[PDB]
Design a protein around this ligand. Structure first.
Ligand SMILES: C[C@@H](NC(=O)c1cc(OCC(=O)NCCCCCN)cc(OS(=O)(=O)Cc2ccccc2)c1)c1ccc(F)cc1
Length: 371
């Protein structure tokens, strides 16, 4: 395909975050940057840190421009403090352009960087509304689109146990079947609306407003499929019931205890598939994405240990890596929609595969959103 050079430009397959190489400053300073659709700030470690192998050295960049303003960004897991500036930025295995972007030099941090993760910064791909200090600090992708010809669209193929980030388009070799789109409800986080949830085909039977209580987002920076407390509780009960041929401790379901199997003997078959129906592009029409235990049971560095990766949240549903690793996801910003298609690299077995199917009839989907 025409976008071949961007294929396989991500790393972090069996790791702690998917990252892409980004070259900043002049002379060139390339760093590993976490791909995060759950935030909107581009920031890079700029001082030595125990978990960082390399960092941004502003004094060595002749093109660096100090903005003379501090910036602080808290996340679900950790936070960092830094200094704002702008510099030249290019993505070697991404678009063939170079833009001057806002860059936050991370000088201090608390539980942000992850030991052994190999990434030294973060690329917040969400919208300006949630950028810090405020929405006036233009995010990287916004700069890319405004300064260049690059189409306002990117797509992610996260390959778990690194993947491809196609910028400006789509590569058809990354998925099979059809692409199904759900509207981006509002441009801040990549917010979507979930209208129905099934465990092995069985409806969880909860008011859809509960599935999006507060909000539902697609976030490549979050490991798990996080669900509102009420939904999490009902989901776990149903999953346990469907996998009753085997019993596991309560801690396993809370992500506190790991369960290991002899190398290559994990009974994937005893666990149910999980389906999330998303609002479609046509009135009263929806489609569903289905993941396998290979997606929600994550390996932990002759024993194969796994952690149940569906957890609870008090800030809404978060469709993280657990969801994204089963699909090729198209962030069509230009048409305010997110597309899903079965990923050509998703992990499965000879009996089941992840799926994206439709259409389905779902009424009153507009009422599912939180106001
Ligand atoms: C990068 C990594 N992300 C995480 O481990 C990560 C990020 C989160 O919130 C967003 C956030 O903090 N974004 C800010 C950027 C990340 C900062 C991390 N301190 C929440 C989160 O919590 S969780 O519900 O998934 C349970 C959990 C906790 C710790 C480790 C694994 C799983 C885990 C990640 C690992 C694997 C992936 F496939 C994708 C992402």
């Amino acid at each position: 395909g025409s976008f071949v050079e961007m294929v396989d430009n991500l790393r972090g397959k069996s790791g702690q975050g998917y990252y892409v190489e980004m070259t900043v400053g002049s002379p060139p300073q390339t760093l590993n940057i976490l791909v995060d659709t759950g935030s909107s700030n581009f920031a890079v470690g700029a001082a030595p840190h125990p978990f960082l192998h390399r960092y941004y050295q502003r004094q060595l960049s002749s093109t660096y421009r100090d903005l003379r303003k501090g910036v602080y960004v808290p996340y679900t897991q950790g936070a960092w403090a830094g200094e704002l500036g702008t510099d030249l930025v290019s993505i070697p295995h991404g678009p063939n352009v170079t833009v001057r972007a806002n860059i936050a030099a991370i000088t201090e941090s608390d539980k942000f960087f992850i030991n052994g993760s190999n990434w030294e910064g973060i690329l917040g791909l969400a919208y300006a509304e949630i950028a810090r200090p405020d929405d006036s600090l233009e995010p990287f992708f916004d700069s890319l689109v405004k300064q260049t010809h690059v189409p306002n669209l990117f797509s992610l193929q996260l390959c778990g146990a690194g993947g491809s980030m196609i910028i400006g388009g789509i590569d058809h070799s990354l998925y099979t079947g059809s692409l199904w789109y759900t509207p981006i409800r509002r441009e801040w986080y990549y917010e979507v609306i979930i209208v129905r949830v099934e465990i092995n085909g069985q409806d969880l039977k909860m008011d859809c407003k509960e599935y999006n209580y507060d909000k539902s987002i697609v976030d490549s920076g979050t490991t798990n499929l996080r669900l509102p407390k009420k939904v999490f509780e009902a989901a776990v009960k149903s999953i346990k019931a469907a996998s009753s041929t085997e019993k596991f401790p309560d801690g396993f379901w809370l992500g506190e205890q790991l369960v290991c199997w002899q190398a290559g003997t994990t009974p994937w078959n005893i666990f149910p598939v999980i389906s999330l129906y998303l609002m479609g592009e046509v009135t009263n029409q929806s489609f569903r994405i289905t993941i396998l235990p290979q997606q929600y049971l994550r390996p932990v560095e002759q024993d194969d240990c796994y952690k149940f990766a569906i957890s609870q949240s008090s800030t809404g549903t978060v469709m993280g890596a657990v969801i994204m690793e089963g699909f090729y996801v198209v962030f069509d910003r230009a048409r305010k929609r997110i597309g899903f298609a079965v990923s050509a690299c998703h992990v499965h077995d000879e009996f089941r595969t992840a799926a994206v199917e439709g259409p389905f009839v779902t009424l009153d989907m507009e009422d599912c959103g939180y106001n």
